[PDB]
Ligand binder design. Sequence first.
Ligand SMILES: N[C@@H](CCC(=O)N[C@@H](CS)C(=O)NCC(=O)O)C(=O)O
Ligand SMILES: N[C@@H](CCC(=O)N[C@@H](CS)C(=O)NCC(=O)O)C(=O)O
Lengths: 201, 201
Amino acid sequence: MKLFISPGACSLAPHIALRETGAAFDAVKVDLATRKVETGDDFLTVNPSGKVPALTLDSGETLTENPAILLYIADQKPDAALAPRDGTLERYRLISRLSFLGSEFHKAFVPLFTPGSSDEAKLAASTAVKNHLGALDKELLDKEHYAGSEFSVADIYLFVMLGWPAHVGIDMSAYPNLGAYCGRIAQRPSVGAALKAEGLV
Amino acid sequence: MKLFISPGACSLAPHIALRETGAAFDAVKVDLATRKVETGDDFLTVNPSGKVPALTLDSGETLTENPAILLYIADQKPDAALAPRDGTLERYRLISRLSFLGSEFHKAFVPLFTPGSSDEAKLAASTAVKNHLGALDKELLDKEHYAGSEFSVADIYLFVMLGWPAHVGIDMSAYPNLGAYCGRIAQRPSVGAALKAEGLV
Ligand SMILES: N[C@@H](CCC(=O)N[C@@H](CS)C(=O)NCC(=O)O)C(=O)O
Ligand SMILES: N[C@@H](CCC(=O)N[C@@H](CS)C(=O)NCC(=O)O)C(=O)O
């Protein structure tokens, strides 16, 4: 199993998840600017869109999109309970949270990480992200975990994106429930090991 | 069970899925500007983001996010084969397709349907949509279905988004494979029923 990454990108989420399940895997770096794998392979052969993450299974089939990859990884080690069982309401609430993170929260950041973007795109995206952070802050005031009863791929995915505001001029002091949440998650051995393997600490 | 809609919006996809399965539900119109249900209720008490779709279950809980709502609808009637059984490779490929549609394709259109948006933002959004349409057009040449070998919720979801370009100045005659795909899907009675219920025909 090979996970295709770029350090600190949304690919960190499945990186942490594989460490949480103990799966055998290779973490392979991609140069997002040239779309080339560190091995020199053309990454567009693996993911035609050129984006990370991509997960190549032992069969040689490649899966894309964080929500699908993260569920796949959780489901291979049910004892880890990183996703609820098939046919529970909690399983749909998890998919809901993964779709919100990928479709709303992630995409809020894109102008802030585009040097091309206007002075006013950058400020409006600033606003959208700070709005998301305010609602996430109050949601996690009342609960330890982002989805259902216990630590899940949804917490892993949120945790990774809560590492982004500090790089685009947003002070995470305003969101102290998010602070503590990131605090607790960062102490997990899986999380420190992924942060170290990607060169982020 | 109530599905909160705005006519022709992405809430048409679960509306069509529910007519496919024959589940009992109320279709409930929302004025997205005033966040007011056609009943006069505050929509923010149902979905705090104020977006459609939202699906209130009989158990009384509310699901948001198309990918989650659409899988829930499919799995209420496993019989109808609108999604593969959970835990199969087929299931994760379907979740990958729903994530791509929700996070990449849907998001390209946002500036074209945002009341505020500049001419600049609309032109950029038009370019991103046409790039997606060219890719989808080539993918659907030698396919009949978007996901797997069967009509799925991913086909319903893509179908609805493919009805948007003609409303925002894009000429769909440049995408003949999408033209044929939409042509076939438009004959399903679920589609007529949903459109008529939303008052679009
Ligand atoms: N919808 C995709 C998004 C993947 C994505 O946008 N990845 C970024 C890194 S955070 C990337 O590879 N960007 C490079 C590019 O788009 O050229 C998912 O959820 O996996
Ligand atoms: N990621 C959400 C997005 C839903 C969405 O953007 N819905 C639109 C209609 S297509 C909406 O309610 N817009 C009103 C608003 O954003 O205020 C999903 O997949 O359910």
